[PDB]
Amino acid sequence: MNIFEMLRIDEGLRLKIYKDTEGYYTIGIGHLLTKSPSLNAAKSELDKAIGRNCNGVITKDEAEKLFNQDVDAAVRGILRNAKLKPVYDSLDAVRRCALINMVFQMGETGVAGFTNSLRMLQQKRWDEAAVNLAKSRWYNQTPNRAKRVITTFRTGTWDAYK
Ligand SMILES: [Cl-]
Ligand SMILES: [Cl-]
Ligand SMILES: [K+]
């Protein structure tokens, strides 16, 4: 298990534009296109992202290219965020992947708002952090995925993805 395999499980792979869990146009392995309700706007974002007129459909290799870019951007995003960087640096490699997963799903700003959970993670108060993480819109709206991520933070193992 690694961050790519983890997010591939959580996000799936679809080669046509689809709506994500929040109703937003997305493609590939959870590549958000736009929050606009306009399908034409989403198709424009897609073509810009890929560099050709895709008419709402991409190939697996293109999906995986966007995924590489998105994972890189989530990680470097963590390192550029003054709230997230110290927590990330304090963590082991498996728990780092849990934090990357949250940022991929909700964005840096959103994750940086988990102030109390982040502090418990930095303190290595794993059971307490896990309880706190679940007190969230995130958990209530996507509970099965959040439970997997939270188990990863609680244990520092891949048990929820094996
Ligand atoms: Cl709750
Ligand atoms: Cl879920
Ligand atoms: K998805």
Side-chain angles (χ1 to χ4, degrees), residues 1-161:
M1 191 70 34
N2 60 56
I3 186 54
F4 289 92
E5 291 182 6
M6 184 202 205
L7 279 163
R8 170 66 180 78
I9 286 163
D10 288 334
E11 293 293 350
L13 171 66
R14 298 182 79 179
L15 298 183
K16 314 184 252 183
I17 296 176
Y18 65 95
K19 290 182 186 178
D20 74 8
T21 63
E22 290 298 336
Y24 298 135
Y25 291 121
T26 298
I27 202 162
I29 306 166
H31 184 79
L32 178 62
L33 292 165
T34 177
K35 291 187 208 259
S36 171
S38 166
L39 179 60
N40 284 338
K43 292 176 161 177
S44 296
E45 287 303 306
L46 178 61
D47 292 349
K48 175 169 58 83
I50 302 297
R52 69 182 179 84
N53 280 317
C54 299
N55 195 39
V57 191
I58 63 178
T59 67
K60 185 165 172 139
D61 288 355
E62 288 165 342
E64 288 170 345
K65 186 176 181 149
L66 292 181
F67 186 41
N68 289 323
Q69 295 176 347
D70 292 345
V71 172
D72 188 2
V75 181
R76 193 63 173 279
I78 286 164
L79 298 189
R80 282 169 175 165
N81 181 287
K83 294 185 182 168
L84 297 178
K85 186 191 188 178
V87 182
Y88 185 85
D89 281 343
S90 79
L91 294 170
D92 61 276
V94 174
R95 295 188 172 89
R96 283 171 183 179
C97 292
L99 191 65
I100 299 159
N101 192 305
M102 293 187 73
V103 167
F104 192 100
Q105 187 180 1
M106 55 191 110
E108 137 188 334
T109 296
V111 179
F114 276 73
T115 304
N116 302 322
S117 295
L118 295 169
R119 178 173 89 151
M120 298 174 197
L121 293 169
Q122 189 137 0
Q123 294 172 312
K124 307 192 181 295
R125 291 175 185 197
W126 306 125
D127 285 15
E128 288 167 278
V131 169
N132 189 264
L133 280 164
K135 294 175 185 172
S136 62
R137 181 179 186 277
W138 174 52
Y139 178 93
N140 284 100
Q141 298 307 129
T142 50
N144 286 354
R145 186 205 185 138
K147 283 172 187 279
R148 292 192 288 277
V149 173
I150 292 171
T151 290
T152 309
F153 278 126
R154 186 180 49 85
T155 68
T157 74
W158 290 115
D159 289 357
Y161 291 88

